[PDB]
Symmetry: D2
């Protein structure tokens, strides 16, 4: 049998976008209220309050009404001005990518770059900051998804704070699926969104903003105002007694309301544990069957995405196509410089359940063996299952 390309697949195991929880999809179907209806104004405020609790924030997070590249570009546009000297940390596609926006807003850019299977070394950061007291803004990506690797953002953020610089963090593919919060890493801007670990639909940005960052952006004549790129316009929009700069994405807010309830009701630590367990089982299976996890070390592998290195000689695009056509299972490609180098399996929200690692392993192994590899698929399943069974 073969799954047609036009027909829906059986299981989507991708690393962004990902399927939303069934309850969230139902929440999307709530009646669309007028945004100035008192019931919507109250809902919006309570959604911001739930995001605040979720992010363990001392102040309100900002919801912006586009998907997280909006938050990222808006942060650069608003926080970085030509007087700033930016240190950009790049260990992957998003880290490197942020430097391009930084350079659009200040000519002064320094970078620490490591190959796209590695993590940024906090000692390298401490040294760079000591050598360059002129540094005023530092940007970092927590989970650089196209590599499935994690940077030590809490240590980095502490170093950056001691230096006296502002920190911009991309936690789009980490928040909700592992222990991380704006104040854990001393973030001045902390960008996340609904459609990775939180299992909500795509199209919103959730942003932690420090009081210090508010003052810098509001002072900056070059910060976007009356613009889709404006963070400053949205400062007070959380309040039931305040207007919306432009019409919010009402249905997405309904979905996010449900997703926040699910997260908080299940308990963040329980949610993080099942992300990590699913990823750990996946990695054990990949290694046991004869494949390699992309990450330079197991310690930096993401608990929300496993990136599997393509064996030299295998056509990675054809591999993913075979996994869908033969088994109905959809994996993520790489992106930019990781495209063709690896395959990604998301473990995010509804797919952060260990049984999906079992499905992923079987489809990935079967596809690989159809490409002429001779993987020990059975051994891989048994190794993944041993991890699940060992979990205390």
């Amino acid at each position: 049998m073969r799954y047609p390309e036009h027909a829906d697949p059986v299981i989507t195991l991708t690393a962004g976008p990902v399927n939303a929880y069934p309850e969230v999809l139902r929440g999307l179907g709530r009646t669309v209220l007028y945004d100035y209806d008192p019931a919507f104004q109250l809902l919006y405020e309570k959604v911001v309050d739930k995001a605040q609790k979720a992010m363990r924030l001392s102040n309100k997070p900002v919801i912006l009404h586009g998907e997280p590249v909006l938050g990222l570009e808006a942060a650069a546009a608003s926080l970085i001005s030509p007087d700033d000297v930016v240190l950009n940390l790049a260990s992957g596609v998003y880290g490197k990518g942020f430097g391009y926006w930084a350079k659009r807003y200040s000519p002064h850019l320094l970078e620490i770059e490591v190959p796209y299977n590695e993590a940024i070394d906090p000692q390298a950061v401490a040294d760079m900051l000591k050598a360059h007291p002129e540094i005023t803004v530092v940007s970092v990506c927590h989970h650089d998804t196209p590599s499935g690797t994690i940077n030590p953002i809490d240590a980095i953020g502490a170093l950056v704070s001691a230096h006296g610089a502002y920190l911009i963090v991309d936690a789009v593919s980490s928040f909700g699926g592992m222990k991380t919060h704006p104040e854990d890493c001393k973030a001045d801007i902390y960008v996340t969104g609904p459609n990775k670990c939180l299992g909500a639909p795509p199209g919103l940005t959730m942003m932690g903003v420090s009081e210090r960052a508010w003052a810098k952006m509001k002072a900056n004549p070059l910060a976007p105002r009356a613009s889709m790129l404006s963070i400053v316009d949205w400062e007070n929009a959380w309040s039931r007694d305040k207007p919306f700069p432009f019409t919010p994405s009402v249905s997405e807010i309904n979905g996010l309301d449900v997703a926040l309830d699910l997260y908080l009701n299940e308990g963040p630590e329980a949610v993080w544990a099942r992300h990590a367990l699913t990823a750990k089982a996946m990695r054990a299976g990949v290694t046991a069957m004869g494949l390699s996890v992309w990450a330079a070390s197991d310690s930096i592998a993401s608990p929300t995405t496993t990136a599997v290195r393509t064996p030299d000689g295998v056509d990675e695009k054809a591999l993913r196509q075979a996994a869908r056509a033969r088994y109905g299972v959809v994996f993520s490609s790489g992106r930019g410089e990781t495209l063709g180098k690896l395959t990604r399996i998301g473990h995010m929200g509804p797919t952060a359940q260990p049984i999906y690692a079992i499905a992923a392993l079987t489809a990935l192994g079967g596809a690989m063996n159809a490409a002429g590899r001779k993987l020990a698929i059975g051994k891989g399943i048994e190794a993944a299952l041993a991890v699940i069974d060992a979990d205390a």
Copy 2:
């Protein structure tokens, strides 16, 4: 009895946002596919095709992934260069508002402004173009929603074309509810969205772009690129064989797919007829009960929104609060200059049905009379019913 502010209303008859069609709300609940899943790639392409058909476009419209203020800003940012001379037409809040974006991108701004219950005279546009042959871009709003009035964009567009200038049209609150299409007004950029007359939730922009406008933007090195404000980056994104600049709003695209199906299936002409008949009945009722339609003349009143002038000594905010608390019926406030001066009843998508005009008239009359007016509410209902019956 009284409807609590915290609880949902019974009927929302607002002018943006508005309730989506129940079929569309169910469409939002579809499983969220990977955007690079071939089934989603196909779907996205087919949605653009359905958009092209609905908009009667000779080329592909662009879908942008933000609500229509994104399209308006991006159009100004991409089409207006610093050597352009822009003529902005302002008959209300959105028209006037656009001139601020124009001025951002060219210091050369001319304007025709009329009172905010009037429409732009095509003869005034012709006189201005004769006086200023250096004009290269003209911008206009079709339905300036906070006023509930309509500009003669097809007449205006013919004169803009006669002068060899580019036309930017905001048809956000008119497209799908009346006969209007990019071709009809010779628009170079035509901006609309799905959450007014089309009955889908907020969050997307549908933009008609002329081949001439494509050439102008592509040649403009200041036109946004690698930006949420970029139109040019999305040029080829409609195609199943091409990437997305950033992640599309998958669930919104699912809703839009359904909305376009409903519009095309019902028949655009039949859709426009019921919008216009609902508005016509509403206006007849408003006048018969002793209230005044805001519009300076009936000929310029929108078939998609009726604005009713607030009588002297009536608190408009209290009036809307009373209509909801007493009857469970929600109306729109004005915006900017019209805030506090008028009340808006939307006739859009699901609410473009004459029976909703009857509900509206009753709730509006009831709230007015509770504020001390002495309206002939029964006469209002009979006049609106006569309008409906005369069309039967």
Copy 3:
């Protein structure tokens, strides 16, 4: 304009079936669990518990997995045996109809019948019971929907209890929309369902059963067992630790779960008040415009359905067809002996909001005037609105 028969209508104001609440329709879309999954077993038990609370029952109500004619036939089949002498009370289609099932299960049938716009007189019942000590079972309909009239079931039930007979009550179209509960009327069998006042989808029966009724049915060799008509088979099925005689209607149970939450959260007295207010406004409008409420007296008119007498000469079928074709509003026909005599407007669940009485009045009046009547429609709306505005 005209609404095609094949296309969906705008507002459904019928008296059974009726639209379900939006939340309930969403609840219908929950994943279908295995019925022996512990989470479903628990859900089922908590649904029975919520029905118990709703019905103010001292013991568990029984949910049967077909629409309420199942409960009615099952009650006759199980409780009535040939030794019984049944007094059937008939003031309408369902009351009379029950006598046919009674006669199937005992040859001994006595009846009190009144014309189908009247209510049963408790004095007539007291007299009949005194004259016939042999009576052992009495059946009564609370709201005989096809007439829109209410019987005094609490007084009747007390008389029946004093006699020492069993009482069977049909409260299908009354429970949830007015003050009524099994123990208010000393019911031995009290049959209701989800899809009238409770705003849940059709296909289940909720049944209050007295301990005395349990003992009579379980003793009866002729009571259905291993049958769709079996009540006795389902006695213990409420418990998470017990099996289901046959597979329950899982999705309907999901919907009922949500409907019970809505009812209990809003508060039963508040729900009943808005049913009554909507009906009261409707009746005021009908009378003021020049039509007649079917009920012999206002005191017996249902707060959950208004039946409007067809003017002699008017084609009632054509009237309903015109109301839908012209205004998109759907009314109920009569049934059996009330078919052609009256039109029904349901005020049930989501349609028990006074603004819908306003819509109903306008469509009914407009349709009537298209049939050549000369109703004072405006006067009717003003009378309905006065009732709403007077409500303290």
Copy 4:
């Protein structure tokens, strides 16, 4: 980690009820129309038409408004008269169970019974019919689900027809998942439903009735009439111009409409192929890991359910509890005689995808090994994968 009993599972792989298709679940959420709304009358007619097409029927199938035990009981009540001589075929719980209903309606009952992992031999049916030419009705179950075994109903039906007798077929758990149709087995009553292979929720019966069976039932004065057990009352109900005996399950009909669309759109042959391939892979895996399929031979194993024999000393209930608590995967118990003796994995509608067999094998192996077995789980997965790959 452990999945709480109170919380939802991750994957349900049961044999009835089963999860519905997500499109069907959204279909259940359609607005509930009045059943006499012309749009619903049309829809109901078209659903019966789609049912006729799917069932390859020369006449209209009857939809009854109760889950399929209603169809089975009603078929016995209507087709079997007291002078009929019934031959009941029993190879499991449902087959044996039907004889109890037959005996209710005729005292003349003959039976062929085989062990509950075997199938009925068509030659034994031929021998019995020769021995008892007075036989007038024969009843048989196609897939006796609690055993996961299949009877040769087409062979049996040809011999029943050769003897001039009527055939009643239970195809509740086979229709839509394998090649089977009323015509194929010369059935006079053919009972199925939508909540197995068709992936709609429980609550309806779809019944094929031969013209000969119609004549027999209509002439039977004991066939239920004015009863939820009545088939004859529903004879003309399919028609948009005819009434419904009682209120149809509107929302279920909405779901069925969608389910039939999915089945016809995908292609019945393609649907049957993936059921059979999923079951075949499951059986290969079960055997390879060291477990036994219940069925006496592979040739009689159902392509829609695999039953796995419980090893000596394994608590089957604890096993299912372990599979859910450890892996979030839900299996079916046996029923009656097979309860405690086997575990069932359904391959039905949405779960008839080979990747689910992989999830099933892993959860089943894992739970077995936690109960002290020493299964070759990896060998199991590879055998199931080889089956999938051989069909590719």
